[PDB]
Amino acid sequence: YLNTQSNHDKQYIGHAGELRVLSQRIAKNATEAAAGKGEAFKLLKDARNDFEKRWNILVNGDESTSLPPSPEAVKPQMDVVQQDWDGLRKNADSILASEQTVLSLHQVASTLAETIPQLQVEYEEVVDILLENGAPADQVAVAQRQSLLAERILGSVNKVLAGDENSVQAADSFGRDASLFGRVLKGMQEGNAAMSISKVTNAEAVDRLNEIAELFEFVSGSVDEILETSPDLFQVREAANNIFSVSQTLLDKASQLADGFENLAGGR
Domain ranges of the chain: 8-99+237-264, 100-234
Count the neighbouring beta carbons within 10 Å of the beta carbon of residue 81: 24
Give the count of alpha carbons within 13 A of 29, CB side only: 23
8-99+237-264: CATH topology: Four Helix Bundle (Hemerythrin (Met), subunit A) (1.20.120)
H-run or E-run covering 243? helix 203-264
C-alpha to C-alpha distance for 99 and 37, rounded to whole angstroms:
10
- In the chain, which residues are last before a break of more than 2.5 Å from C to the next N? none
In the chain, the amino acid numbered 56 is N
Beta-carbon contacts of 58 under 8 Å, excluding residues fewer than 6 positions away, are: 12, 15, 16, 69, 70, 78, 257
Structure obtained using = X-ray
C-alpha to C-alpha distance for 66 and 255, rounded to whole angstroms:
24
What DSSP state is assigned to residue 195?
Answer: T
Task: Note whether 8-99+237-264 and 100-234 share their fold.
Answer: yes
First to last CA, the chain: 29
100-234: CATH topology: Four Helix Bundle (Hemerythrin (Met), subunit A) (1.20.120)
Give the count of alpha carbons within 13 A of 98, CB side only: 28
Given resolution (angstroms):
2.5
C-alpha to C-alpha distance for 148 and 128, rounded to whole angstroms:
15
In the chain, the amino acid numbered 23 is S
Residue length of the chain: 268
Q: Yes or no: say if 52 and 45 are a contact pair by the CB < 8 Å rule.
A: no
Q: What are phi and psi of 71, to 5 degrees?
A: -55, 155
